[PDB]
Amino acid sequence: DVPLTPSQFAKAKSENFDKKVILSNLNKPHALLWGPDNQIWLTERATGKILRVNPESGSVKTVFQVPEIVNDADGQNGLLGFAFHPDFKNNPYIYISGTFKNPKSTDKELPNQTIIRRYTYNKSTDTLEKPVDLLAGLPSSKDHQSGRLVIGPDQKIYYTIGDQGRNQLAYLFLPNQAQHTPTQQELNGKDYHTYMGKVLRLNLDGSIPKDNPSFNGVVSHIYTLGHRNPQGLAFTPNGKLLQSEQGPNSDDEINLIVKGGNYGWPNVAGYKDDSGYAYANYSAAANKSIKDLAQNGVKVAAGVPVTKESEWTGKNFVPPLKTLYTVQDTYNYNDPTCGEMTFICWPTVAPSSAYVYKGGKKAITGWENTLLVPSLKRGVIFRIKLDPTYSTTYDDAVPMFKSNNRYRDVIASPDGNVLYVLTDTAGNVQKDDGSVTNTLENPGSLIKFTYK
Amino acid sequence: DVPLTPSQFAKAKSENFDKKVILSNLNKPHALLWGPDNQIWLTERATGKILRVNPESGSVKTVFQVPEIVNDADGQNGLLGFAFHPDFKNNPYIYISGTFKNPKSTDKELPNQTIIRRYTYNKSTDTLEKPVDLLAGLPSSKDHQSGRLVIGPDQKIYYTIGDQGRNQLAYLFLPNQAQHTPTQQELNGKDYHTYMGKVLRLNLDGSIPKDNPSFNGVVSHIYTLGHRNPQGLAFTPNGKLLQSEQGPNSDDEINLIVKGGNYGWPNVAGYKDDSGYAYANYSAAANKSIKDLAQNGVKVAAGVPVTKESEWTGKNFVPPLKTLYTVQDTYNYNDPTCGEMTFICWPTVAPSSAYVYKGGKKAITGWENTLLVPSLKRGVIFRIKLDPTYSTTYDDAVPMFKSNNRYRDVIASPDGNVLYVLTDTAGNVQKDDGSVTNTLENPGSLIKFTYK
Ligand SMILES: O=C(O)c1cc(C(=O)O)c(-c2[nH]c(C(=O)O)cc2C(=O)O)c(C(=O)O)n1
Ligand SMILES: O=C(O)c1cc(C(=O)O)c(-c2[nH]c(C(=O)O)cc2C(=O)O)c(C(=O)O)n1
Ligand SMILES: [Ca+2]
Ligand SMILES: [Ca+2]
Ligand SMILES: [Ca+2]
Ligand SMILES: [Ca+2]
Ligand SMILES: [Ca+2]
Ligand SMILES: [Ca+2]
Ligand SMILES: [Li+]
């Protein structure tokens, strides 16, 4: 899709909702869920705290704090995945993922691992207990961790793990592994270094499902590959799997996740269109003093090999359902017509989640079969219509709740007339007038939007 | 997708198949079917003849000639739709569509109608009898008739009817009706003038299914709208409906047809990307001597209103699964480096059909879940892979059987190792080196390709 203008974002004020801020100054709140007790549960990525919030009064209790979570002030690591067992009455389990020290790391630049872990909720002591590591030794870095964790209708764990930031900024010269898959030998050794830029599908005990797809002749935890930073993952009522993902300077994506698919990253951003992106592989550059021009591979410094999207020899490439956004090759990523901070003008929205709106007794008129996608950079939440079979999007991503906030997650109440939203404590966001600000209106908040 | 080069087309010679011409004396052969008698049936568009060919021996019979079919030498009208009832043993019906004079027409420039008609097959005399007009008074013209007629798993007729060529060449100043829909009053008077650029869904007696979708508050025969020239229509084994469609100078499409969808034409060609096309509405030009520069609306003469794809206010817009092909706004539709007939290099392939490959006990390796799309202009048959649920394409359109032929239709034998194709009698086609020729290697032929 084509980017909206600053004026088109500014008018998306959602006057048909009442806003109430329930909490602010949470410490990097990240995921929120409607709990089995019809209370709101949310995580703090930086602290490992799991908080429960009463919808009526807003009273908050720190139910548990995941010990030994590692978080860097400038990093996207910490406490990440968070899900309840779907049959919680009979299976009172909470599933998380988190950044933890890796004691066998022999790489001081990458000292941590990601672990997917199960906890048991004890209703009598009202806390979590009896941890069990389901899958450890996963990649960890400060960038593009993703870490969305959901339980599918098949009672498998689906877990997004980002490309760790390879081929940009602090990890510019590390080779991106989004396209790579393990050998049988690596699997035998539990060497999961290729579990970067993937959707994983795990048995509830952490083992490899025997019906997982095969990649390069090996069945592993990998379900799909070729992802950058897929922070959104949600099943539809008819069992399909929708997803949002952050692109580079362009081509954030809404994807339909299909078993064994290849979503193209880093060789293809968005559609395979050779439009506004090319794959510049800095790990293959002649030397590591070369500079990233940050023009999305359309123009690069001498010495870095570039591969057009159309030159990639790919298998099972699956294009996005929608891009937010795609631009022409002649697009100016340094466009001087906004300020010294051109990145705010890049044709992206930085989607942070993806939530399937299920309606209810007070369903919002017209919202049938929609996907809600919060935007960090634009300070909106998108509403994206699909057809009733969730086979295609209809029309465009409709912005809502415009504010100077970085929207991080969103759910709806069971009745469907109330939305609950998390915002980041810090970062940049685009103002009504299109310029950037790092003054956020509601830092680290839980916000309630009630349909009038 | 990005266009293949002339080199890339010329290399698609399919040396793994043996070619044999079965018939070479056909006049504008149009549709090809594997019949319920395990014979090949095919149509001649201008004569109205229905032929049956023994696939083993090659003997042929003219089973029937549809009387009073109207065809213009410079036109795409004539005998079009052709399908068997799916339970032919117990319901020996054949359904056709055709161009016929319209005795009610008061327009000497549009004197004809399209009629969807049923015939009863008499196996004792081997001919068609008892004609019955199921739906009459449909639009007719020389351009963009489409006319694919299939019967779905719901035992409804699905029928493609093109946009009649409005807003180009001889019909430049007629307002395109692809987006328009009937009022209830128009349905009462059987005024089907808005049945242009549609997929229709009809009951087997021609009536309106009671569960057809609503458009602008009215349920009609329309199932989907917003099409230009959709000549390919085919159901998958799991009940999904795939389609191919010719775009203007760009953006031929493979579409997934979903109930109630809007496929965007003429406001959107291909994706809603504002890339290489814009909607120049010559009917809205105040001056009717204005010229169409034929640069796909990117460059226009003074006086014609132009709407960008992103400026359209649309409802239920469904993007294509794949475009053949999409180019940048900087694309040159007049590239003199291509030869004096610059249209031959345009980023299109002119798909003429769409066929779901079902395999069999001699299925061609790697062709699971493929869609075969014949190309008129490039003289190839494309193979397009989808995932096993037919929810997404995988990778690109792979060209096959390159020759100096205009491929019009394609089917496969039950065992899956033989493909049968029809070729046009006349027209232009791209040669190995990219230039244009109107010398076709196999004019008006039924050809088979056998895997060896
Ligand atoms: O303008 C863009 O394209 C853009 C903007 C941002 C932004 O939020 O400022 C991000 C981003 N997302 C996170 C996150 O925690 O999800 C952290 C950052 C960051 O740059 O610090 C990304 C991206 O990561 O692709 N792209
Ligand atoms: O190069 C292109 O884009 C292109 C090329 C052709 C071509 O075949 O030469 C056609 C076309 N298709 C039919 C048909 O019978 O289906 C007739 C014609 C015609 O131009 O006479 C179209 C189009 O109709 O869009 N576009
Ligand atoms: Ca980005
Ligand atoms: Ca992708
Ligand atoms: Ca792209
Ligand atoms: Ca065309
Ligand atoms: Ca279309
Ligand atoms: Ca387009
Ligand atoms: Li005839």
Author numbering:
A (entry chain B), B (entry chain A): 1 to 452
Task: Quote the study that presented this structure, word for word.
The soluble glucose dehydrogenase (sGDH) from Acinetobacter calcoaceticus has been widely studied and is used, in biosensors, to detect the presence of glucose, taking advantage of its high turnover and insensitivity to molecular oxygen. However, this dimeric enzyme, composed of two identical 453 amino acid monomers (pI = 8.75), also presents drawbacks in terms of broad substrate specificity and loss of activity over time. Briefly, all crystal structures contained a tight dimer of sGDH in the asymmetric unit, the dimeric interface extending over 1110 Å2 being maintained by the presence of two calcium ions as described in Oubrie et al. interacting with the N262-D273 loop, referred to as the 4CD loop in the nomenclature of Oubrie et al.. 2Fobs-Fcalc electron density maps from the wild-type and both mutant structures all showed a different molecule instead of the PQQ-cofactor, corresponding to a PQQ modified cofactor, with the bond between C4 and C5 missing.
We report the characterization of two sGDH mutants: the single mutant Y343F and the double mutant D143E/Y343F. The mutants present enzyme selectivity and specificity of 1.2 (Y343F) and 5.7 (D143E/Y343F) times higher for glucose compared with that of the wild-type. N428T and D143E mutations significantly reduced selectivity for lactose and maltose, with a cumulative effect for the double mutation D143E/N428T. The D143E/Y343F mutant presents a classical Michaelian behavior with both monomer sites equivalent and a single value of KM. For example, at physiological concentrations (5 mM), the Y343F and the D143E/Y343F mutants have a glucose oxidation steady-state catalytic rate constant (kss) 1.5 and 7.1 times increased compared with that of maltose, respectively. At pH 7.5, the addition of catalase slows down the aging of the enzyme. By consuming the H2O2 once it is produced, catalase indirectly maintains the integrity of the cofactor and compared with the enzyme without catalase, increases the retention of enzymatic activity of sGDH for at least 8 h. Numerous attempts to co-crystallize mutant protein with glucose and maltose substrates all failed to locate the sugar substrates in the resolved structures (data not shown). Indeed, as can be seen in Figure 4, the rotation of the pyrrole ring obscures the glucose binding site observed by Oubrie.
